[PDB]
Amino acid sequence: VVGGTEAQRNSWPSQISLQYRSGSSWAHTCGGTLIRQNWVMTAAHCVDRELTFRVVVGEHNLNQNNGTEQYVGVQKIVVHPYWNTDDVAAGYDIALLRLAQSVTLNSYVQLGVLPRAGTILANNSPCYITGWGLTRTNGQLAQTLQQAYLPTVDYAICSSSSYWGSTVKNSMVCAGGDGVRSGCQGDSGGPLHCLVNGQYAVHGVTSFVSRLGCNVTRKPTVFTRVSAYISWINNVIASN
Amino acid sequence: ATTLXXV
What we know:
Helix content of chain B: under 10%
CATH architecture of the largest domain in chain A: Beta Barrel
Keywords: protease, elastase, inhibitor, hydrolase, hydrolase-hydrolase inhibitor complex
Chain A: elastase 1
Strand order of the largest sheet of chain A: 1-9-8-11-12-13-10
Structural class of chain B: mainly beta
Strand content of chain B: 25-35%
Order of helices and strands of chain B: E
PDB class: hydrolase/hydrolase inhibitor
Largest interface: A-B, 28 and 7 residues
Shape of chain A: globular
Shape of chain B: elongated
Structural class of chain A: mainly beta
Radius of gyration of chain A: 16 Å
Assembly: dimeric
CATH class of the largest domain in chain A: Mainly Beta
Number of helices of chain B: 0
Radius of gyration of chain B: 5 Å
Number of helices of chain A: 3
Oligomer: heterodimer
Entry title: Binding Structure of Elastase Inhibitor Scyptolin A
Helix content of chain A: under 10%
Largest sheet of chain A: 7 strands, antiparallel
């Protein structure tokens, strides 16, 4: 997250850290949203790879066990059928991860609220992106969970020539693009929390940014539109 | 586009 601030410890209890086993220890690679004691929602490209994945709930500082964290492995990976590992701009960048054991829910570990199927946010809706990705475009990964105000940029605008043009599909969400704040390498799969009538809900899954950099004017961070996959999500959980 | 994960 570029242009953000260290989030208040566990203020986004559904935010999780997707880590893969590297050597003897673990390494953070993506973010995710806990949606069931045993299910995590993240980006497809975070899990194409044949890696040993672990998920951390109740996390904040990736380099210290503050005692609120829970470490569980990923038992099964379910990438959306239409996902094309070679064309992120094609969309369908979402995947569900059934956990080895179910996490114990508490004040640090909560499920994320998903929008109603098909919900479309009005332009410039208040949202916050959260993650452990880079904090300075072309810099270092964050030790502590970061957050940044990232209001939405409706399709009309986002798909305009000056913005993302044809790169963005209706099944996506754009936020930010003001040049100062945006997601960055390491935030993928993470959530985009949007406030709608007092209620927060994960409307997007962090997908991509421009080759030119993270915080690039008129190239807002792009997320998979959660409200566009509710049916798929429920089906995957029900039949697994 | 480039994914925020380093893909």
